[PDB]
Design a binder for this molecule. Structure first.
Ligand SMILES: O=P(O)(O)O[C@H]1[C@H](OP(=O)(O)O)[C@@H](OP(=O)(O)O)[C@H](OP(=O)(O)O)[C@@H](OP(=O)(O)O)[C@H]1OP(=O)(O)O
Lengths: 221, 221, 221, 221
């Protein structure tokens, strides 16, 4: 985080040990359930790339996943570097050097330049692009850790409908696809994969039946 | 939350990670018992739709209930959009764009727009209507998740009257009904289901007995 | 159709009997399989709306199909009327009047009027618009008359991959969801539903593989 | 096509509806078996590129086939542009301009232009060149849609030699390797894959035997 001192100049503030330990416990306990992404984005609000690096390195276990995240961050940094070629020439006192692909990731940047980049007007959000790369990696990790694809979620012969819907929507949350495909999956795959006992009821209800109506109608079975 | 900086400009503040973890734990332990709604409205005091979306997304299990909440929010947003038609024309410097139905939910807006909305005079409380929609959805979820119907709560042969009346009133709170049906239930169904030893005293007491009078009348057994 | 007589003046020419015979064979024997649309769009080459109605009377035998077609025509005519409000005022005597939603449909127009409309500089196409509305109706009918859903197209244990791909693409063309859902279906659902051996080869091939490579690699299995 | 009117001036004549109907039947029912090419080359007799595009829109139903066809057209157009650099300078007013790679394809040309191009002394054929590019695309598609490789065409225990030869030559015409490999296939692979009795007779006949003698000697076996 970045805060203003008494004089009003921006000063970095280290993350409290409570937040850091909460994030570490979330990563080590939850495996990589899909709710880690919102929790991470809530715990890392307006943080400098050094803070993100601390929040990532501090994790003790799940080292394979952190390695995959390292690979994804490196690929995104290389692509960004290719997109922005270096402008040769001395930097005027009124500006600062343009951050390269690895300057964003914090492997070759000091704290002061990172503070200066996004506190400048107009701002260049190093933190908000680094967090985008990290979240893009976490999406792949979460998708990998989820057991089964959405197309293989099937209600058992005896399973209650509420548990089946819970499994289906957990898997769909873990799924990686655009929003339109997710809407189609919600509309059709839910009815299509049900057990024979509830499939007839769901078809008889109609094509525009809301989730509440389906679950209250299939409550007994 | 909304806080002022040193200069006096409104600045968004992230929710405390302790509060967020407390809400997640509340949803973990309490399932969807009726006391969740006051807890939510206490933990989400004066929060922008960004914070509400964070607090809703962070929940890990019970994904079917969160999907019902999503559908209810969508219905309320569509009804709001129909109720307030779109106005065509350029935006004056002294005003801001009129929010649409999907604008209140925070899924198609920035945080700065909402900050300006809920601080500009006259206020347009996006947060205070999003919280209304969320509570409206949570009410249906709580009613549906009630483990047993009111008619099935009956005092046991050896159960003291305190336990039976507590179970009955908790179930009555969960199964939300109108006021007059609640009055009839309290007056008649409470007496009807009791064990014979308590039923005799309740009947002999009279029809217009308050809850305290019944509880202190049947205290001996 | 429209032809030029010996005096250089455009004159309507009726649809030859065997073209109507071919369209009647298409309607009565193809059972509204997804190939009715190309054959209609071929047989109706540059036809004035009177000829379009002459070809449409064949569908009048099927009550449900003709009802769907009439409803779609009327809805598109209403939308056309809404989007083109009739201008009240003097018009240049060298120009023709304006086609109403019931005059582009040939219900209340005469043949000379449509001939003048089509043979104009610049031309105002009425036949093409009417044909687009008819094709919308036929798309709806073909979607209704589909024999199986896209999620039920599964390759047999020993069916060649080419037959399965042709069946899948025919069903996907009948169902006609949006474009993005179609791309997702082609990329993922095609691989998912295949028989074990072809599924193994397609999985081992990799993700995001063009159809040519899939069919070439899975040729003799 | 191109016809001469009553004044002796070449005028374009549209493709009759039933020719387009026949081509649509060819596309939709033959499943791109190796006989689509002769029927296309027959139905497209002397057609200006506008008519070629009109016939090509039928293939637009098949996404993959149309993509392959479009790619081949574009590649050949690029090669044509490269091999015929546009000459900048004055031209004789009695001569027409030069057809670009996107003007021989009828995408950016008008009908009168192509009529003038084709009806020239000496003629500059645009229809024939466009048809050659289309046939290249169709060859690629037919090769993709083949049901079995040439090495898997084996005569059955009791299949007559004539049926086996016809199947073999159809598959060899689909696969369309170079000419020398085709001659080697015909000479050797045909004898190699035959059933034991016909293989014995063909071996005993000798090497370098014409097809007529092979089929005459192996008639009733
Ligand atoms: O080769 P042809 O003897 O000229 O056959 C054609 C051909 O029929 P088939 O391919 O079924 O044999 C036409 O079919 P299209 O592919 O053009 O559709 C068909 O026209 P219809 O489509 O109208 O059936 C026409 O039949 P018709 O005589 O009714 O015009 C018929 O010609 P023949 O009947 O003279 O064989």
């Amino acid at each position: 985080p970045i805060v203003q001192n008494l004089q009003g100049q921006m000063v970095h503030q280290a993350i409290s040990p409570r937040t850091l330990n909460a994030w570490v416990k979330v990563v080590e306990e939850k495996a990589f359930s899909p709710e880690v992404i919102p929790m991470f984005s809530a715990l890392s609000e307006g943080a400098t790339p050094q803070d993100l690096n601390t929040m990532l390195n501090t994790v003790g276990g799940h080292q394979a996943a952190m390695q995959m995240l390292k690979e994804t961050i490196n690929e995104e940094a290389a692509e960004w570097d290719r997109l922005h070629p270096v402008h040769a020439g001395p930097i005027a006192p009124g500006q600062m050097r343009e951050p390269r692909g690895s300057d964003i990731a914090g492997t070759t940047s000091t704290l002061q330049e990172q503070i200066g980049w996004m506190t400048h007007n107009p701002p260049i959000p190093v933190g908000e692009i680094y967090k985008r790369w990290i979240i893009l990696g976490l999406n792949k990790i979460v998708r990998m850790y989820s057991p089964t694809s959405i197309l293989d979620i099937r209600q058992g012969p005896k399973e209650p409908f509420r548990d089946y819907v819970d499994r289906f929507y957990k898997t769909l949350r873990a799924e990686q696809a655009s929003q339109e495909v997710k809407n189609w999956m919600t509309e059709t795959l839910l009815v299509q994969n049900a057990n024979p006992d509830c499939k007839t009821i769901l078809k008889a209800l109609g094509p525009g039946a809301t989730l509440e109506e389906m679950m209250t109608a299939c409550q007994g079975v």
